[PDB]
């Protein structure tokens, strides 16, 4: 029993974290086989960062301008190239700790584990969702650039996020591992803002199922609703429209609990209209939307 924001065990990723330094700028890199991946912002000085021309800055660098350190060992860079917003630094040593891995791009609404890192040294692990507006509500300080986000399936690490920057609202933006940003952002220190965000409806419903599996059922009711009628309420409260595919993905949880999805939708409708009246659900006083159906099934009893 119990329900916690749970991250994947970080060990396989810890073995891949290195430090990359160019000039007086340092950040984290990801060392897989004989390549170190890192944000191209590492070739920027403070003055470059307002309006960097990265191809210009890069052509003025040589391999030996890149100091890569893995623990006590300096790695010799033997080649470098830029792919979108990341650098690929070819090194002369293949990482003996390289896990089975994939570079995947995730969808808004999906979750992943973040290994926060500083100077190539892992400092903490926590779970994040990709927000509908392609930001993440992370916990990152200066030096965190290059920390990665990932999921683990069997023994394969699917890397999905490399951290770059913090927006003025305090939220975070980054790229997939081929250096393509999530959302309409660029790696320069300019005024940028995210689109308006929305709440991830299918995830809230998954979390309501988790609560029932865990014995919170005060919010249930005898009512039902149609998909169309629920989506009318969702738009009022800035929730995402619910689709038949979301109803389908919720199938297993609805079968485990005996609560029809549209019945749980009616429960959610009342919560949105009434609030909670001083009660809690799985220890929260608000509707949690950063657990996917998969997260719920993975963690909850069958």
């Amino acid at each position: 029993s119990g329900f916690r924001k749970m991250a994947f065990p970080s060990g396989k990723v810890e073995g891949c974290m290195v430090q990359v330094t160019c000039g007086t700028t340092t950040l984290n890199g990801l060392w897989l086989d004989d390549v170190v991946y890192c944000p191209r912002a590492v070739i920027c000085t403070s003055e470059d960062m307002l309006n960097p021309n990265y191809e210009d800055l890069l052509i003025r660098k040589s391999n030996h301008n890149f100091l890569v350190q893995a623990g006590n060992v300096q790695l010799r860079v033997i080649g470098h190239s830029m792919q979108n917003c990341v650098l690929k630094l070819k090194v002369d040593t293949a990482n003996p700790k390289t896990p089975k891995y994939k570079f995947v791009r995730i969808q808004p609404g999906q979750t992943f584990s973040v290994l926060a890192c500083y100077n190539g040294s892992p400092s903490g692990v926590y779970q994040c969702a990709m927000r509908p507006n392609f930001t993440i509500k992370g916990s990152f300080l200066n030096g965190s650039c290059g920390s990665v986000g990932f999921n683990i399936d069997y023994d394969c690490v699917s890397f999905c996020y490399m951290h770059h920057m913090e927006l003025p609202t305090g939220v975070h933006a980054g790229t997939d591992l081929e250096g393509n940003f999530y959302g309409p952002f660029v790696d320069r220190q300019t005024a940028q803002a995210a689109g308006t965000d929305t709440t991830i409806t299918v995830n809230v419903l998954a979390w309501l199922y988790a609560a029932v599996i865990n014995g919170d059922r005060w919010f249930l009711n005898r009512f039902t609703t149609t998909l169309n009628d629920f989506n009318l309420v969702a738009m009022k409260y800035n929730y995402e429209p619910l689709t038949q595919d979301h109803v389908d993905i919720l199938g297993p949880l609805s079968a485990q609990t005996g609560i029809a999805v549209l019945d749980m939708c009616a429960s959610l409708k009342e919560l949105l209209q009434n609030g909670m009246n001083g009660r809690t659900i799985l220890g929260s006083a608000l509707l949690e939307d950063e657990f996917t159906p998969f997260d719920v099934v993975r963690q909850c009893s069958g």
Binding site: T26, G143, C145, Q192
Partner: peptide
């Protein structure tokens, strides 16, 4: 306010 690229100082 502006975006902050969160690299560190060597």
């Amino acid at each position: 306010a502006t975006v902050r690229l969160q690299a560190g100082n060597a």
